[PDB]
Structures are given as structure tokens and as C-alpha cells.
Amino acid sequence: IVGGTASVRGEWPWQVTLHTTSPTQRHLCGGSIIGNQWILTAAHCFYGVESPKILRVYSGILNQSEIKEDTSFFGVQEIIIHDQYKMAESGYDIALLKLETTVGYGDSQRPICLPSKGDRNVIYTDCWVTGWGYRKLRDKIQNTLQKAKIPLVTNEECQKRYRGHKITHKMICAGYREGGKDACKGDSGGPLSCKHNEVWHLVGITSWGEGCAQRERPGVYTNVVEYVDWILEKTQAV
Numbered sequence: 001i002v003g004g005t006a007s008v009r010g011e012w013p014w015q016v017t018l019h020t021t022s023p024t025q026r027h028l029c030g031g032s033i034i035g036n037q038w039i040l041t042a043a044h045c046f047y048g049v050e051s052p053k054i055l056r057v058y059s060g061i062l063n064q065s066e067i068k069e070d071t072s073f074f075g076v077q078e079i080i081i082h083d084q085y086k087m088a089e090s091g092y093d094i095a096l097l098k099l100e101t102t103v104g105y106g107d108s109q110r111p112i113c114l115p116s117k118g119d120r121n122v123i124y125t126d127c128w129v130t131g132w133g134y135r136k137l138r139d140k141i142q143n144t145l146q147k148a149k150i151p152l153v154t155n156e157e158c159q160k161r162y163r164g165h166k167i168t169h170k171m172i173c174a175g176y177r178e179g180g181k182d183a184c185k186g187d188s189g190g191p192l193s194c195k196h197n198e199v200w201h202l203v204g205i206t207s208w209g210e211g212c213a214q215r216e217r218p219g220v221y222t223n224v225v226e227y228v229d230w231i232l233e234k235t236q237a238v
């Protein structure tokens, strides 16, 4: 997160840190708890990941330093990548992780509400991107979970900012015209959480951008409202 600020413990209880074990254990990406065994995240996070066995999901974490060999985690049973996914820049950058065990909800960890089909028309004014990613282009994984408030940008505006790319209605953009606050390397797969009628909704999933926080280069996020039926298909399968 560029131009962000330290989060406080329990501010984003749906946020998770996804670690890979190969070759050495490290933070890979963020994700969001959406159900008792479901983490929603970005598809591009698994490029090169051959098996779920090398993955560890940590919840209720403010600081990466809370993670050591004796820290409890959730094993991944299944990696579900959307069938249409090819690359972040082309869309369908969404994935689900089915956990080997059930998340016990509490004040440190709980789900974020998915957006409603009847809310695709509403305009969100209170949007935040969160993660442990770089604070600048050549930096490192941050210890403390960062937050940054960013304005949603219309698709028409985002399309002007990205000549040569096709910004679809399955993508949602966020950024200040002058730059300064954005997601960066290590933030992908994490949430763009928007507060509406005193309830937080998972509006976006960090996906891509041209550099970090550049002027007239807003962040591009998966438009979660457009994938609610896909999530229900995978999570409510008979």
C-alpha cells in the first residue's frame, strides 16, 4: 500500500495473508474471508503454484511478525481458479480457496458481506484498499497491515487512463487523478472494502495497475458484484 497508514488490530477482520512454503515460507498475496471455509482472492497469485499443499492461510493477523513456525494456520484443500482466467490484465482475475478446516468466527476474524445485485446501481463513497505490500515500487513486504482510502473511478474514466487495454464492466477502478494512494506488489488478492449503510461489502479484489500510485493510473480491481453467481456456484455446489 502506497501513501497508506498502519491499520489497528481488528479493523479488517476478513483480511488474510496467504503464504507459500516453496522454496521458503513467505507472504504471497492477500485474500478475504467470505464463508467458514472460503477465501476469495486473485487468480494471478497462483502462477507457478503446482499444488495447494504449499499454501498456508493466516487470519487474525495485524503484523507478519506474529507469524512463526508455531503460529496456527488454515491448510488449503482446493484452489478454484475461474475457467476464463488467462492473465490479470484480461480479467476474470478471481479465485477461491477451500480450506481444510472451518474458520471459527470472532472479533479477530469474520466474513465480509458480498455485494448485492440490487447494489450494482448504488455509489460507494467510503472505499479502502488494504495489504502488507510495498510502500514504493522497489521496497519490501511490510510488517503491519496498511490501509488507504481511495475514490472509486467510473469505467469510462478508467478506460481513458488505460489506452491499449480493454477495461470491462467486470473490472472496477480506484485512484486519485493525481496518484499518491494505491495498492502495490504484495497487496494483490486482497480486498477493496466499501462501507454502505453501516455494512462493509467486498466490492473489489486487488488485481493490477501500471506501476504503483502514479497520477492518472488508478488501480484495477475485479468487480466482485459481477462474480456473485460464480461464487455461489462454487460455494453452494450440491
Ligand SMILES: CN1CCN(C(=O)C[C@H](NC(=O)/C=C/c2cc(Cl)ccc2-n2cnnn2)c2nc(-c3ccc4[nH]c(=O)cc(O)c4c3)c(Cl)[nH]2)CC1
Residues within 6 Å of the ligand: 026, 027, 028, 029, 044, 045, 046, 047, 048, 133, 141, 182, 183, 184, 185, 186, 187, 188, 189, 206, 207, 208, 209, 210, 211, 212, 213, 218, 219, 220, 221
Ligand atoms: C508469477 N506471478 C506474477 C504475478 N503475481 C503477483 O502476486 C503480483 C503481485 N502484485 C501485487 O500484489 C499488486 C499489484 C498492483 C495492484 C494494483 Cl490494484 C495496482 C498496482 C499494482 N502494481 C503495479 N506495479 N506493482 N504493483 C506481486 N506480489 C509480489 C510479492 C508478493 C509477496 C512477496 N513476499 C516476500 O516475502 C517478498 C517479495 O518480494 C514478495 C513480492 C510482487 Cl513482486 N508482485 C503472482 C506471481
